Symmetry: C6
């Protein structure tokens, strides 16, 4: 069943790209404009927001998508160069895709967790002692995070199935 | 009369996609900017808005459109792969489309109801006791909700007619 | 003279589509941010704006354009399906186009009238008794309304001429 | 010298379209946001701005461009319809283009004049007695107005030269 | 060495167009929003900004680019008209391009100078006596100005080299 | 191994272009709007921001990308001109690309360093003595800076490998 696997993998990849490109930028538009802290100190909002969200989810997902698509670009460009052999590059391409997908999934888990809390406790200079800050659209961001995790997991499973179908002797050489 | 059914189904799908893509993003632009609560507590606006609208309508409809279109993409990609049999995949594609459409319609009803009230009563921390908040463009959003429900219902009816035409005997095999 | 009629109909349809798509969105961009009421009550602006303009003109016109273009799309897709008879679908398409155009024109008149006043008197909760609110760019919106009415009337007249050319005898059968 | 006339006319038309489409919308973006009146009365800004600028320049120019291009569209669509005679439609097209261009130029002069003053004196309700309001980017708007007038005048002269070349004898028949 | 000249000229023209189109509009986005004067008089900001920057740099550069490209458009359209002689049009086009480039460079120098100061002294009505105003991103605008001047100078030198290569006897005839 | 080098070089170039074009403009959107200084002096924010960030990172990277791509454009245009010899232009193109890449990398290091601090001490007129200002999203900008440096270094290494492969003897002649 190596064919249905490829069909599903292509469909899932396209689905993820479309969803991100269409909704992600709009969801995270006012992330910093609607972030508010209970204080009068100038500059506390900037510091607390930067501590709460070092990297936005949307940029991480864009980077992940491009990086995961890169090996296919390598293979296609190699094929173009060859004309005006290819049965070996394919195995290495598959292995690299598997490694990249797994690494990105693990990194997402270790960076963001599984939910976006509605409150944040911040104690960065210049804020005096510890202050409380309030996040914008926590529930939508939680839903987006869980959905992206599920899609990435499906992709990982399909890639592992493909790699197993090839056989580890192909991967060895 | 299986041909007029397909014609109407295609026309309705295109109509829904066009309407959403052209007007939806503009209707819901200032959903959070124009949401106001009668209070002085910092952070009450964020909490009350997040409780009132956990997920925006437009994002739900975009997700629904992509998911409903997915099975046709699966079928087209399978057909492409086959060349450089297909009479069985079509039945499963139809069944999956029917199930997805019905599920999305039911989910929309259970999530949003049939109207958007102009007032909201919010009792989420940090708001003190219970406060009153006011929504932006409730009437336009109600009209949009009802129109989308009607279009989805028409799609469901056409899909059921198609599935009935194919037949239960054929579906079983 | 059934040819010049078709030429003019196509030209006016394209003209209307272009004008709307190019200027309408920009005209109605700040409709709600520049709407102000003389009061101190929170939430009175939202209620009064929603009562004054239940549906924006631009969205009504977009819906009208798509709906009016739908029958031609149905005819085209039926023609595509036929290859890989058509002289009867054409009459029904013409009749449906006539009905839709007339209905949309009448609806526009009954919804918006012929002018956009510069003042509004609002007595919706939470506003206390009666308040006075001030509209943004009333004159430009009045000009746009009248222009759209005139274009739609021209389209209706051309469609009626076409339908008369076809003849009642043919329409009946 | 009927050929260089056509070459110059085409080049000028393209030049005008490009200039408008590229810069006009950006010039007039903050026309109402940066318009300020010296008063405390709510709603005086809206009334005074609407009285000072009933129709924005950019929208008038867009309408003019589309209307002037319409007759060529009529001719092209007629030519397409003819295949799957034309030496007479051309003369009427030229005459209509001349009339439209002259009318639009005269209308622009009678609507806007030749300059945009930096101050405005406004006595519209609800403003008390007479107030003073201040315009945004008067000099750039004056330059744009004069440039558009010059380009339209060049177009009118070229069209008149073409019409004279065709001849009154031919035009009458 | 008439070929490398043409190659470099084409490359430089494309480079200038790309740089402007990509960064210019973003650099000058908040030119008026971030312009502030030290006063309490309503309307002083508008007058002082209009006096300081009668025409934005970006619009001047867009106009220059279109005007400089115009003669090539004239030549191409003439060539198209000729088919369904040309060795004399080309020299006239070269001369016109040289004149336009030199004129635009001189005009830029006389209009803007070589730097954008960070302070402005403004004494325009309604400002009382003389006030001080502060500009936004003076350094980036200075860098952009110098870069555009250098690119235009390179273009002028290449055009002069081409014209000299053609020879004076040939331009006279 | 001169083919895999070219494959990797093309892939990394495309990757860098995509990442910049997609995320850079959004990261640096509110650079000046969210920059705040602890003072009451009008005009201190503008001066301090201009001193802290003379040129935005995104514009520098756009300029670098276009300049690095220029030599390939020159070579392609020369090839087009040649038809309707080339083995010597290629070496000079490679050398120029190497020089440009190295220069841009060194310039980036000397201009921006390796991190974006969260605080800035500013003593520019009109600010009184020293003031403290707070930056927006320092961590994301630091990550972007480091990532761009790494990608540029990889490109430099690949270019040096290519140049070494061609040979010093060949480069001399
Ligand atoms: C369909 C979405 C629209 C929004 N952005 C501008 C117009 C349209 C294209 C998209 C962007 O160019 C873009 C192009 C390609 N890939 C993208 C991937 C992600 C993205 O934002 C997360 C924007 C992307
Ligand atoms: C026609 C609408 C315009 C508004 N958005 C940017 C330019 C144009 C395209 C559209 C967006 O890229 C987009 C592309 C494709 N499908 C879409 C589907 C939905 C949507 O918003 C709900 C935006 C979509
Ligand atoms: C020409 C207008 C521009 C403004 N909008 C984005 C870029 C360009 C396209 C248009 C929009 O995508 C769009 C596409 C197609 N039909 C439309 C119809 C109506 C509309 O606004 C009323 C926007 C439309
Ligand atoms: C080149 C200009 C850009 C700005 N607008 C969106 C993207 C690009 C296209 C243009 C608009 O779609 C548009 C299309 C066609 N004709 C137009 C004519 C005028 C215009 O504004 C006055 C905008 C136009
Ligand atoms: C690549 C730049 C993007 C920004 N603007 C909208 C989308 C893209 C196109 C460009 C504009 O339509 C445009 C088109 C063509 N020539 C232009 C020249 C100059 C310009 O701004 C100075 C904008 C231009
Ligand atoms: C894919 C990104 C989207 C955002 N901008 C508008 C729509 C889409 C295109 C891009 C811009 O036109 C653009 C075109 C080409 N090269 C670019 C390079 C850089 C850039 O910003 C740093 C914007 C670029």
């Amino acid at each position: 069943s190596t064919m249905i696997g490829r069909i599903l993998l292509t469909v899932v990849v396209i689905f993820r790209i479309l969803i991100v490109a269409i909704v992600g930028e709009t969801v995270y538009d006012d992330e910093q404009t609607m972030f508010v802290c209970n204080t009068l100190q100038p500059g506390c909002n900037q510091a607390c927001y930067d501590r709460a969200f070092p990297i936005s989810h949307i940029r991480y997902w864009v980077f992940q998508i491009i990086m995961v698509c890169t090996p296919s670009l390598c293979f296609i460009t190699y094929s173009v160069h060859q004309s005006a052999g290819i049965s070996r590059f394919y195995i290495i391409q598959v292995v690299f895709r598997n490694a990249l997908e797994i690494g990105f999934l693990v990194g997402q888990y270790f960076l963001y967790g599984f939910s976006v809390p509605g409150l944040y406790e911040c104690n960065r200079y210049p804020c005096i002692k510890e202050v409380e800050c309030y996040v914008s659209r926590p529930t939508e961001k939680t839903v987006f995070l869980v959905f992206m995790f599920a899609v990435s997991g499906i992709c990982v499973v399909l890639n592992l199935a493909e790699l197993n179908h090839l056989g580890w002797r192909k991967i060895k050489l």
